[PDB]
């Protein structure tokens, strides 16, 4: 139902938070002038999890497939609705008499 929208929103928010955290960590590291290139593992895990969750959630809202067989939706069509022509309607019948003559 509508839970997939919440799931994808949560995933996007988590990805944005991970981005902000990585940027802040890089800005702090450039101050201390340390050439160790220390990337925390928790940030990588968080961003990978958020990306996976977001992709899984967004794959379920793109829509639904439909059969390509042209004779698939006419299995339930009946001749009652096929003989009605809206352009040639005429209002001269007993329906007027029955209801408030």
């Amino acid at each position: 139902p509508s839970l997939w929208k919440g799931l994808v929103g949560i995933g996007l928010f988590a990805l944005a938070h991970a981005a902000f955290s990585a940027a802040q960590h890089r800005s702090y590291m450039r101050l201390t002038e340390k050439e160790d290139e220390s990337l925390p593992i928790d940030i990588v895990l968080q961003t990978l999890l958020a990306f996976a969750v977001t992709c899984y959630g967004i794959v379920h809202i793109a829509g639904e497939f439909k059969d390509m067989d042209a004779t698939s939706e006419l299995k339930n069509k009946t001749f009652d609705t096929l003989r009605n022509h809206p352009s040639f309607y005429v209002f001269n019948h007993r329906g007027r008499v029955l209801f408030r003559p």
Binding site: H93, R94, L98
Partner: protein, 193 residues
């Protein structure tokens, strides 16, 4: 007179009212005044000038009536125009076909002008087979077993919007699980007297 019963009249009115914009027709059976009818079976609505489905329905209904010791004796039709109440070729052909197996068969035409909500008249024209033609035997007669009860029951059924459950032979052909004997209408007319 033919002295139509109450069930046949009520079912005929309901079938005529279910599809106001179309033309409907059915069958009348009698037990094996003059000839008392028992009930009616609605056959078709829409386009009526086609042979095969009419033949299949006639055969099935004839076999069913033969099983329960009945006989097809009447044919009722209602046109589409509000100012048209005369028989056409299809009705004459079917009535002539029926007449060869049962004498003094009836050709009933529904009159759209008198198709009022509760009742103003029996709104029925009865035609009898004289030589090779049909004549309107209408001496302002009363072609009902008891007019007041019949009109009261028909008015109550029409007011109750009970025509949404009536099923004819066309709906049976669309889906086999439907029933063209209409037990619900029989129960309703038995309870409501």
């Amino acid at each position: 007179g033919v002295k139509l019963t109450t069930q046949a009249y009520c079912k005929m009115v309901l079938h005529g009212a279910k599809y106001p914009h179309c033309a409907v027709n059915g069958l009348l059976v009698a037990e094996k005044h003059h000839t008392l009818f028992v009930d009616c079976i609605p056959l078709f609505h829409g386009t009526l000038a086609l042979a095969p489905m009419l033949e299949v329905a006639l055969t099935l209904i004839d076999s069913w009536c033969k099983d329960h010791s009945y006989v097809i004796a009447g044919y009722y039709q209602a046109n589409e125009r509000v100012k048209d109440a005369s028989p056409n070729q299809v009705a004459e052909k079917v009535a002539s076909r029926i007449a060869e197996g049962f004498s003094d068969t009836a050709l009933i035409m529904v009159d759209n002008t008198k198709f009022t909500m509760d009742c103003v008249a029996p709104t029925i024209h009865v035609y009898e087979h004289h030589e090779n033609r049909w004549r309107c035997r209408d001496p302002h007669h009363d072609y009902c077993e008891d007019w007041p009860e019949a009109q009261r029951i028909s008015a109550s059924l029409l007011d109750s919007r009970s025509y949404e459950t009536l099923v004819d032979f066309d709906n049976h052909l669309d889906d086999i699980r439907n029933d063209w004997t209409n037990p619900e209408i029989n129960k309703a007319v038995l309870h409501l007297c």
